Amino acid sequence: HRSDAAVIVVGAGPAGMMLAGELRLAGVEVVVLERLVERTGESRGLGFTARTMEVFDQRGILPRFGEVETSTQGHFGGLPIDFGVLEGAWQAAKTVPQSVTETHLEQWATGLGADIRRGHEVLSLTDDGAGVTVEVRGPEGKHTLRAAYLVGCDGGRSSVRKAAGFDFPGTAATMEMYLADIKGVELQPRMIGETLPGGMVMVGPLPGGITRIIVCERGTPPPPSWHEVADAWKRLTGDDIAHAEPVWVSAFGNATRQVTEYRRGRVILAGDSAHIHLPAGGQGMNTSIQDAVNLGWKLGAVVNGTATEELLDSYHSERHAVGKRLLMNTQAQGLLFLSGPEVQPLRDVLTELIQYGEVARHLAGMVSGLEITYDVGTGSHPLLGKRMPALELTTATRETSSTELLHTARGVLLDLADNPRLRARAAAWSDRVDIVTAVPGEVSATSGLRDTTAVLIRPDGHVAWAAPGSHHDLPMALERWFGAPLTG
């Protein structure tokens, strides 16, 4: 297989596998180097957000998952919120283990022709502005690979970040917590957590008679034996579970850091390699998958020569902003979860505020990722920069949807008012952008789609331009996200 690719991805976690699939959709030759021979089989995370559900759906990935339980029951820092107040938030997957999601993403990417090389550890890396050479240890021993670009999707302790000179400011961990998947004992469920006099606790069932416990005890300084975790449980809850059978026991911290640059030269980061934090609020995997979704189409266009690196710079500006918000979100939730009775007054105030619809929707927007808004220029149209909500469509020949039209990761221009001029203005981008004339289905008052005659949708599903109500014109938007018009 040896020696060259267009893009090398380090790491086959959720970020790397989603990225690999996205690059394949862009027609890019991609090699993934993963040190592990076999998926860790972990599933620290359970379920995924409504926005993650949507980014899967828009690539036609969901049938791989079969029937998936969804839920509108949410929380913020353990404060319950009905996320059903926010349109589309219902799409959150409740229970799917991270290992299962990873499996489907790997199978998808591989099916698309990603060259995934397991048992290959990147030991080091080099970048001169022509390319990136990595040294790798595989089954064949030590060897080198070179590509135009290298993406570190190699996790919170990223070799790539360390080697490629990224600055990683933030705060050092101040506490160690535990999780344990266990058998034998039946415990009273606490799906959104339980505030205790000396900390916090989560309890929940998993298939095969497994109970998952999350143990966050007061005053613990930052692989754990089961009995210290049991001892932590006993002190917190008063209940002895030392007799249980430990399936998996793990430790984690609250170190919170983010790279100042998502790209240095030809070396880019996506996922935990760019941002680490307390895993509070079910955000890390979701954000990491979504980093890859932002990146893949852009890096693909650059590799394909259809876009300049101005486009590539927008991965940094858009995702650094999301990552900053991620750190705020998780730190805020962590404070509410983990601080003692001291923080109760603030829990109580926030609880009162949650009773207002705008607050419930605000927090739901933050947790679900449905709030995410990119700078695509100004205008009155409510959807600018936001994700395109699912929209049913009837064309001259078929019934389809915005979601389905995104399966090939192209741009999509919806002509919702049969305007042939619109079709002609954009025809110079028709090699990169599918121009679809359709009658739209019924849309809600709050969807942002009422009275909309046209929408330009980026390959990631975000709205770049809409009519009416964009200050920038359509060709400006097409040029910004798709590059130069075709020469007639």
Which residues contribute to the site for Zn ion (CB under 5 A)?
138
Selected range binding ligand FAD among 9-17, 229-237, 315-323, 431-439, rule: CB under 6 A: 9-17
Q: How far apart are the C-alpha atoms of 371 and 352, rounded to whole Å?
A: 22
Residue 285 touches which of Zn ion, a copy of itself, ligand FAD, none (Cβ within 5-8 Å per kind) = ligand FAD
Cα–Cα distance measured from residue 290 to residue 65, given in angstroms and rounded to the nearest whole number: 18
Among Zn ion, ligand FAD, a copy of itself, none, the one that 11 touches (CB under a kind-dependent 5 to 8 A) is ligand FAD
Q: Are 31 and 303 in contact (CB under 8 A)?
A: no
**Region binding ligand FAD by CB under 6 A among candidate stretches 40-48, 85-93, 198-206, 215-223:** 40-48
Nearer to ligand FAD, 280 or 457 (CB): 280
CA separation (Å) from 417 to 28, 421, 445? 35, 11, 18
Q: Which does 332 bind (CB under 5 to 8 A by kind): a copy of itself, Zn ion, ligand FAD, none?
A: a copy of itself
Contact of residue 33 among Zn ion, ligand FAD, a copy of itself, none (CB under 5-8 Å per partner type): ligand FAD
Which are the contacts of 8, defined by CB distance < 8 A and separation ≥ 6? 30, 31, 32, 33, 132, 134, 145, 147, 149, 150, 151
Count of other CB atoms within 10 angstroms of residue 198: 15
Each residue 334-363 as x (binds a copy of itself by CB under 8 A) or -, in order, gives: -xx-----xxxxx-xx--xx--x-xx--x-
Among 36, 328, 346, 484, binds ligand FAD (CB under 6 A): 36
Neighbours of 457 (CB within 10 A): 28
> Please, are residues 269 and 259 in contact by the beta-carbon 8 Å criterion?
yes
46 contact, one of a copy of itself, ligand FAD, Zn ion, none, CB 5-8 Å limit per kind: ligand FAD
Distance, C-alpha 123 to centroid of its chain: 26
CB of 3 to Zn ion, least distance (A): 9
- Enter the tokens of residue 406: 């995104």
Report the candidate in 445, 441, 347, 425 with the shortest Cα–Cα distance to residue 390.
Answer: 441
Judged by CB under 6 A, which stretch of 182-190, 280-288, 400-408, 413-421 contacts ligand FAD? 280-288
User: Using N-to-C axis directions, what is the helix angle for 284-303 and 98-111, rounded to 10°?
Assistant: 10
> Rule CB under 8 A: is residue 92 a binding residue for a copy of itself?
no
User: Could you say which of ligand FAD, a copy of itself, Zn ion, none residue 439 binds, taking C-beta under 5 to 8 angstroms by partner kind?
Assistant: none
Q: Give the pair of three-digit tokens for residue 403.
A: 């979601």
Residue type, 67: E
Measured from the CB atom, the residue of 191 and 343 that comes closer to a copy of itself is: 343
Is residue 317 annotated as involved in ligand binding?
A: no
Taking the complex as a whole, the smallest distance from the CB of residue 367 to a copy of itself amounts, in Å, to 12
Q: Which residue, 42 or 392, is less far from ligand FAD as judged by CB? A: 42
272 is in an annotated binding site: yes
The contacts of residue 437 (CB under 8 Å, 6+ apart) are: 395, 396, 415, 418, 423
Q: Given strand 131-138, what is the order of strands in its sheet? A: 121-128, 131-138, 141-147
CB of residue 328 vs a copy of itself: minimum separation in angstroms? 5
- 34 labelled binding-site residue: yes
Q: Between 126 and 331, name the residue whose CB sits nearer to a copy of itself.
A: 331
**Residue 285 annotated as binding site:** yes
User: Which is closer to ligand FAD, CB of 72 or CB of 453?
Assistant: 72
Query: Which candidate, 123, 151, 148, places its Cα nearest to that of 17?
Result: 151
Query: Encoding tokens for residue 438?
Result: 């359709």
The footprint of ligand FAD on residues 168-197 (CB under 6 A) is 179
Look up residue 424 and give its amino acid. Answer: A
* Contacted entry of a copy of itself, ligand FAD, Zn ion, none for residue 211, CB cut-off 5 to 8 Å set by kind: none
Pick 85 or 185: Cβ nearer a copy of itself:
85
Say whether 390 sits in a helix, a strand or coil: coil
User: Number of helices and strands (H, E) in the chain?
Assistant: 12, 28
Buried b (16+ CB within 10 A) or exposed e, 404-422: bbbeebbbbbbbbeeeeeb
Rounded distance between C-alpha atoms, residue 199 and residue 324, angstroms: 27
Q: Is 172 in the site for a copy of itself (CB under 8 A)?
A: no
Q: Tell me: does residue 34 bind ligand FAD (CB under 6 A).
A: yes
- Known binding residue 44? Answer is yes
Consult the annotation and say whether 120 binds a ligand: yes
Binding residues (CB under 6 A) for ligand FAD: these are 10-16, 33-36, 44-46, 98, 121-122, 153-155, 159, 179, 252, 271-272, 279, 282-286, 288
**Which positions lie near a copy of itself, rule CB under 8 A?**
327-329, 331-332, 335-336, 342-346, 348-349, 352-353, 356, 358-359, 362
